[PDB]
């Protein structure tokens, strides 16, 4: 139930075709770690690999490197003061926590040598047998936070602090911006809640009101994270850029800040594979655009010939079977997602997640949303053009046996399929399949007889896939996506995201507990990139909520209403975008008191660290002896009233001339 | 033709009825002037005054004063650097200008006694008689300045800074502003002289041109700003609150981040007159709109009526004598909104300026744009509804004395006698008139007679009133607003701006030069709240130019047109403005690079001003014996492999081991 004291473990799978040459790489691999004062242990990994055991053994090198790590931090810009305290007595001052050591620990043993490290990082250095580098995870607090969570209702800042603890700051930014997201989710649940009981279906006022929710969403979370950032001493990192391992290079060019020559690469081979997305993108939103109109058209010829025998409900089998589909394409889609983003040389891991945050963004948001895209802005308006699929599957199920009437109400109907089938796939794929995974190799399955189980649970650990928190962002985005701008056509969609959200808050973190290994601990300043995709998604909102509520809600369709809506409705959620900023810039959130108000103490410290008539006739006696040493009329100018009290008189008979005329 | 070192000059009006309490000011007044180090000299002011004036006779003392003023920016992040000089040896390394000199000495005679200065601002303290505190005006410049203005054509950066070192940042910052305004304005002034020749009357092209000019001249002078900034040692001035002397209180609370206690005002109080703002806001509206659709009606009556005997010029009569009565009505009116803003208490400089801005702005928005609002928006759509007052004119000319055909390009004529008599009017108003007025008054008109002229020159320049930079750029900002949302009018516009801002940038340089005295020297990192202004009227040009150009152009109105085009523009807006920000994000200004450099390489002198395997079985073996002093399990598996080599040998075994199965 409790470690070894292991900090980090790496796996080292040592190949029968070149046993050689791993071992070579094996005894230069545990060399380099010895350089740097890690404490080395060996122990069997199974199927012909080494688990090498790592720690620091030397406290005074690890406070060393804590003190070094700190001051890079303070030259930019991060820490507020500076640790002050070269011996380890800042330390007591301010505490390692657990995810600052081992981040501390993965640089030591990720950074080159000109960083003051043995980077062993596996596909750029010679190191190809280099599996996994990962930390272990503590049972002990590991089964106490999942009881915890599941016990409590809400959660408070301090599990999120014990979460930021224990797993880098990335980690605690998602737990805290979905514990966030499911706090601010209750208000449109309750007002869709009060639409699907007053308003009637498909309501202008509720479209309206998810507009300004996401609008007061968005702009509390921007200053929640900022506040957050603040708290946990992160703020900033952002600016600070960390150098990919992997990214390939041909130049060593001139310093741009620092002093450094610093590796370059052609920018124009980069943008000859950024356009290497176009055509990409082009095909598959073509692919999946026919696809969806495929499925569209089989379902509205299956419920137009089979008039539902059995009921409604089978008329949408197709988008049923097209939203189960859905994972298995946006597999391979993910795929060739991130091998295009890794064949796109980039420089940095800032700007090499952002640009992967996109590729994913893009692709998941076609197959989350072209179908309801289909339905809505297409199926809706203008839907006789599809008659060619129609009769082209009445023409084929005629030889294979041997009036249209379009509901604008079926976006609903869809809606609520797509929400629930969307929701059990979901559920179904995230944790139940890994859970029966687990349980299905729990059943199929020397060594000093008294680290066995040590051993044996880090065997299998390394078997497990670290936990990427992209997914469970993306997932809680494509979510927000589906309340901005498909809600109106169904309003209790926010409801079953709520009582979603309540279970994901503790089904995502038992997906970090037991069915992955615990994430090597990064610093963010933020979420990121996906700030942008919650902005793009609430902006998109305002204009599809409205057209869907004209357009369903129906008389021909006026085009003279439908621009008036999308207009009104989109320059709202401008006017409330500006209310609702300067309204937030007035609320003086107390981390940015904190903050300014530090370092003002620490530089007023700094700047306590750093008679009159007397002098004034002294240094007019000066210039006087500098004159009759000799320029002259301003000279004898100012020596007219040299002494104070000469002026006082000379202006008081003065007043007195100018009072005689 | 030169001063006599004089750096200020107070003018202390004694009137004969406070004959006494005026004496007793006058000797308080310049007892405090000689506690803060001022050499203080009495001269004689017309009409029962006393011009004093002061300088620095203390050199060290002012340099004493320089440095601490240098670390107050310090503190607040504006210097890159300390000046790490308590002696003057930092002064040597960084002069000082004359407008920093000027600044110091003005803060030195206004802050009070807490700051370090003797304060004597007339209103809030006992000084009711010190009348205007002002530098002085150097001719040798001015007359060299004024002549190589006019000399060239175009000016450097050199000019520009010249400007700085003499009037502060504020007048610099307004002369670079309209330098750069005047080169972007040949853009839509050579376009516009294009589609006047080539497309016609009320293009589409020409207005989603000059959208996406007024989008890239924004951006690229909020970027031309901050390298303005970071190059002058200003940039995060305004984080500084200067703290208003007219600012009433009430108590004195807790502190903010400093430690000192503030002085608080209820800020109810201040709503119950922020307030004040609505109803006279309605009824300047309301009027100026009666003003407005009179002259127009009495306009369109007189056109219809005569049948133009002379011209259709006498037609448009009424708008060029309403444009001749605008800045009659808009002295009142702004005199109407600075005692409006000035009863509103406010708190710092800058939020009393702002609100200022703000409240003038507004003001002269309507008074400048509402009659083309008129125009366009309601007469040229739907013209019928002001038939009333069509015959209630004809009713009364018919006692007087004893088929109505809209035109669509009315507006052209319309915007081409607005512009050009605008022209006329603002350039009789601006120069011409206050050039006969000084010229009036040269016409019209003891003292030891060798300072006879000086003392002639000071007080003829106590007559002058300050200049303020607000009006010049308000001035500015409307005829930017004139551009961005009714160029499609009449495209010669641009071009007749153009020839007015090169006459302009000469002509605003001579009304400090002669016809004002010169101004008090202040900081600011920018031109401030005009850029809210000018973000606005870019925006609504957007808008306005498209519905003016599918309006005018015209089939009856088809609404279904009218949305498309206002909802395209102004996307196409949005979306160029996303792409302008992400171009200009990338281009990497020298003075960020520069400010971001010495900050780095400061703090890494501070940076730099702060056996492997041996030591690790060293410390194991210090375990070891703690723990043979005596946790053990842990022990005994770190304990296993002590050397490395040991490691290694019993991991190469371990892959014999794994070899053998
Ligand atoms: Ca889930
Ligand atoms: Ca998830
Ligand atoms: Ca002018
Ligand atoms: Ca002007």
Known sequence: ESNFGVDFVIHYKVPAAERDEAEAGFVQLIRALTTVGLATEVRHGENESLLVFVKVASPDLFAKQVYRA?????????????????????????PVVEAERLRLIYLMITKPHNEGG????????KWKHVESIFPLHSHSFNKEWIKKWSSKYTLEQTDIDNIRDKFGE???????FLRSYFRFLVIPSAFGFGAWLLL????????????LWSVVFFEYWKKQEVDLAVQWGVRGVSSIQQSRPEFEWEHEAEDPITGEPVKVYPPMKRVKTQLLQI?????????????????????????????GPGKQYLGFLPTIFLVIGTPTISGVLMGAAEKLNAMENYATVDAHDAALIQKQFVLNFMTSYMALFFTAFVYIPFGHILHPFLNFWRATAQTLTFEFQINPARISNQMFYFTVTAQIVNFATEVVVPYIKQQAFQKAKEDHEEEAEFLQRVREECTLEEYDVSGDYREMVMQFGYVAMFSVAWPLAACCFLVNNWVELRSDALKIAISSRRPIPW??????????????????????????????????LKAWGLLLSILFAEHFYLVVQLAVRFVLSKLDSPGLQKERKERFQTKKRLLQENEHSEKITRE???????????????????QRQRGMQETIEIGRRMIEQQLAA
């Not at 498909?202 to 507009?211: Q, T």
């Open 523 to 556: 610093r963010t300043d933020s979420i990121g990139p996906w700030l942008t995709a919650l902005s793009f998604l609430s902006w998109l909102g305002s204009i599809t909520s409205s057209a869907i509520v004209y357009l369903c809600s129906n008389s021909p």
């Open 200 to 211: 009637g279906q498909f309501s202008y006022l509720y479209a309206l009101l998810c507009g």
């Open 279 to 307: 055509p990409f993108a082009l095909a598959c939103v073509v692919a999946l655009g026919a696809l969806i109109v495929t499925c569209n058209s089989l379902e509205v010829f299956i419920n137009e010939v089979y008039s």
């Open 170 to 176: 990335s980690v605690a930014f998602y737990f805290a």
């Open 118 to 125: 043995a980077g062993v990082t596996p596909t750029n250095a």
């Open 70 to 94: 700190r001051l890079g931090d303070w030259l930019h810009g991060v820490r507020v003061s500076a640790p002050h305290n070269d011996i380890a007595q800042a330390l007591q001052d301010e």
């Open 620 to 638: 007019a006696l000066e210039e006087e002896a500098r004159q009759a040493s000799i320029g002259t009329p301003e000279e004898m100018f100012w």
